[PDB]
Amino acid sequence: DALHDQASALFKPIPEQVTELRGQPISEQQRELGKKLFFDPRLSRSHVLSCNTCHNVGTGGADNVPTSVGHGWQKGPRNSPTVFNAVFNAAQFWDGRAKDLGEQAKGPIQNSVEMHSTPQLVEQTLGSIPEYVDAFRKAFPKAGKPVSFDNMALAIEAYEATLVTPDSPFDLYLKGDDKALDAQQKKGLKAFMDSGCSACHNGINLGGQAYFPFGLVKKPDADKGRFAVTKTQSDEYVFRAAPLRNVALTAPYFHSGQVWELKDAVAIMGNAQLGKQLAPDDVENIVAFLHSLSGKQPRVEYPLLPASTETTPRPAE
Amino acid sequence: DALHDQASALFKPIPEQVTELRGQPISEQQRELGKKLFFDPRLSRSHVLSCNTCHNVGTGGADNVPTSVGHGWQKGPRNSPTVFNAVFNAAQFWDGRAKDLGEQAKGPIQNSVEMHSTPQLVEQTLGSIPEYVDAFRKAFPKAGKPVSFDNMALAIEAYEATLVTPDSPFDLYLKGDDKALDAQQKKGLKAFMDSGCSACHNGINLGGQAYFPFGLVKKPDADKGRFAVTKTQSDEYVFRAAPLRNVALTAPYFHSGQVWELKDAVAIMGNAQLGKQLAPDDVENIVAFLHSLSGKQPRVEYPLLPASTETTPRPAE
Numbered sequence A, B: 001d002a003l004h005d006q007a008s009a010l011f012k013p014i015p016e017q018v019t020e021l022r023g024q025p026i027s028e029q030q031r032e033l034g035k036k037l038f039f040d041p042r043l044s045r046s047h048v049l050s051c052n053t054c055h056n057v058g059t060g061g062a063d064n065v066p067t068s069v070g071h072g073w074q075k076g077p078r079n080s081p082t083v084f085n086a087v088f089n090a091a092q093f094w095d096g097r098a099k100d101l102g103e104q105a106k107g108p109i110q111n112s113v114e115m116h117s118t119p120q121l122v123e124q125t126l127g128s129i130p131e132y133v134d135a136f137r138k139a140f141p142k143a144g145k146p147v148s149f150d151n152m153a154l155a156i157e158a159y160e161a162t163l164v165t166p167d168s169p170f171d172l173y174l175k176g177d178d179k180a181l182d183a184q185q186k187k188g189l190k191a192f193m194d195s196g197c198s199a200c201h202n203g204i205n206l207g208g209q210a211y212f213p214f215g216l217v218k219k220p221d222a223d224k225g226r227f228a229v230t231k232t233q234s235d236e237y238v239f240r241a242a243p244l245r246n247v248a249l250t251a252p253y254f255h256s257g258q259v260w261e262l263k264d265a266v267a268i269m270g271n272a273q274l275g276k277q278l279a280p281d282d283v284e285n286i287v288a289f290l291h292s293l294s295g296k297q298p299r300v301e302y303p304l305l306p307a308s309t310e311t312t313p314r315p316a317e
């Protein structure tokens, strides 16, 4: 089918599982340790914030509130992006100055820990708990200092690699099953490509691979009649093309989390003059199409975190 | 064994499972629905607080920070008590005036919802989500209005009944296995009874059944040399005798969450003039004994919460 043809040229399905990371095989110990860390609020100085707090695995992997402030890169509050399938994103943050985005040498993990705690503090904390000490040795055998920021980061990435959502209808369609998407979804997929959406939203995650000088702003006054995606003040200031997988599960939308309905988000983008102007039917069909991007949500067994000991730092500001 | 004799007269083990609640059998649908609600942050107006936030199932069922404010009964901030085995507690809150505690007609669930949201709001919220609507009908078939505060409360209680921790060593010892507790733990159990601890901390949960006019205060200046448990300003003002099950997992201690070490908490209580003055060995042995109260932690599969719809109220203050 010609439709399946161009689809396959532009998109790729989520693998059933990633087994290697940074050229290293992912062990189960690493996965388990990473899970604990992802849920342990003790990584925050205050002992109340965990990755799961803002990237809630029960609600699409995002907190689903307008904005929050979790990473040091942030110049301000932004909508928390889902953590599902994030491992495939080359472009990680929402926005930034092009020169600075070539200076954000830091990844999400280091960014967050430095913001809500300090690496030294996090190390001292994990070190005071025997169960963690052991878990680290068992997961990183050939290591001098098993409990170190580096390994912690590696462990979390391993768990992150576990949070993928394969087998969404769209993916089944890409893999072959031409019955996966209904007619409306197909008109949508067609319109998505025809209107130039795929110009920016492409690849495995339908986005998350590049930055562009367009961002949502509240109109000076000219949802879909209150906000618009326009050029930034200079092409040096860019926003990441949001990866669309599981988009139906992570409202509100855009970096500021200001539009709550997907139909509006679609209309707004389809009015950004970044392609052929959209027709009502298209907007509807596209939305239907987007729903086909919801994959299989990860089944997570809440980890049992080890108890603090007498040398474990106590909460603070 | 004489020791096992008085032990059995004063204590009782946690049943393997509670199957009935308010004279009604607990179905699995109720359990599942309750689990979702316990983790759904949308029960708070702001969409950021869930029961799990403060009664974290991964860390002993408590948040393990000095204090928090989660229920309307609260006159101030208090340490969040564990939710594990709470269903067996007759006395639910930390403290209060005797006359008012005969007016706290409200339970933890209603107290919390009224504080962080409103019953009407919570009802409107759950009602806007089809998956919940259905889950409610399947869990409460013979019901006029399936989605109602009442049923929500019932569902959560059902899930609460699931959060019990049977088979702690102490319990195995009570059930017979005289090898469950080592010699030190036995000296501890003996001392616990001999020093009058069991006068207040008894029953299935070693506490949580009655109120007494003694509470921790910071000495005017006379941990164990900075705080003390003394009489309240009048026997009308009382504090609940904290249930001790899983106590080794829920530091800090006392209603204000001011003492971090169990040895100190024990010393302080064993100096309250509520029994024979404790000897260093005893304090150590008792602590060892308390550790025998950590039961089997519940294995929880994080629930997949349904997506908000267009009629679902948006976050607020």
Ligand code: HEC
Pocket (backbone or CB within 6 Å): A038, A043, A049, A050, A051, A052, A053, A054, A055, A067, A068, A069, A070, A071, A073, A074, A078, A079, A080, A081, A082, A083, A085, A086, A089, A091, A092, A093, A094, A095, A108, A109, A112, A113, A156, A208
């Ligand atoms: C709320 C206070 C958060 C906490 C705690 C954590 N994260 Fe986060 N994360 C948050 C926001 C608001 C954002 C966007 C920031 C921006 O300006 O871009 C993020 C982003 C990430 C990302 C990048 C997403 C991608 O697709 O590459 C990742 C992967 C991520 N966060 C992971 C994560 C982990 C592992 C955390 C605990 C160590 C962590 N975040 C904490 C907000 C919050």
Ligand code: HEC
Pocket (backbone or CB within 6 Å): A192, A195, A196, A197, A198, A199, A200, A201, A212, A214, A215, A216, A217, A229, A239, A240, A241, A242, A243, A244, A247, A250, A252, A253, A254, A255, A256, A265, A266, A269, A270, A274, A275, A286
């Ligand atoms: C490149 C210039 C783009 C084209 C072509 C389209 N989109 Fe896009 N999209 C782009 C950016 C820079 C952003 C973020 C803007 C911001 O201020 O945050 C987005 C975001 C979306 C979203 C929101 C997803 C989310 O918040 O998780 C949707 C739903 C979306 N885009 C859809 C979409 C459609 C349907 C398009 C063509 C009809 C389209 N976008 C084109 C960049 C680009």
Ligand code: HEC
Pocket (backbone or CB within 6 Å): B038, B043, B049, B050, B051, B052, B053, B054, B055, B067, B068, B069, B070, B071, B073, B074, B078, B079, B080, B081, B082, B083, B085, B086, B089, B091, B092, B093, B094, B095, B108, B109, B112, B113, B156, B208
């Ligand atoms: C933090 C902001 C909390 C949230 C949200 C919830 N709870 Fe809570 N709970 C909290 C505290 C600080 C306390 C002590 C209050 C006091 O003054 O006594 C509690 C207490 C309870 C109890 C009673 C414990 C017992 O053994 O009987 C229960 C059972 C309980 N909380 C349950 C619970 C549920 C089901 C919640 C969500 C609907 C809930 N709490 C929210 C703090 C917090």
Ligand code: HEC
Pocket (backbone or CB within 6 Å): B192, B195, B196, B197, B198, B199, B200, B201, B212, B214, B215, B216, B217, B229, B239, B240, B241, B242, B243, B244, B247, B250, B252, B253, B254, B255, B256, B265, B266, B269, B270, B274, B275, B286
């Ligand atoms: C009845 C008057 C009591 C006697 C006898 C003992 N305890 Fe107790 N205990 C009691 C109260 C009213 C409280 C709460 C005081 C407050 O300000 O919060 C407690 C609490 C404890 C704790 C803390 C548990 C927790 O915070 O989760 C411990 C560890 C404890 N009590 C132990 C203990 C021991 C070992 C006793 C005899 C040697 C003892 N208590 C006696 C009431 C009473």
Ligand SMILES: [Ca+2]
Pocket (backbone or CB within 6 Å): A062, A064, A079, A080, A081, A250, A251, A252, A253, A254, A257
């Ligand atoms: Ca979002």
Ligand SMILES: [Ca+2]
Pocket (backbone or CB within 6 Å): B062, B064, B079, B080, B081, B250, B251, B252, B253, B254, B257
């Ligand atoms: Ca406590």
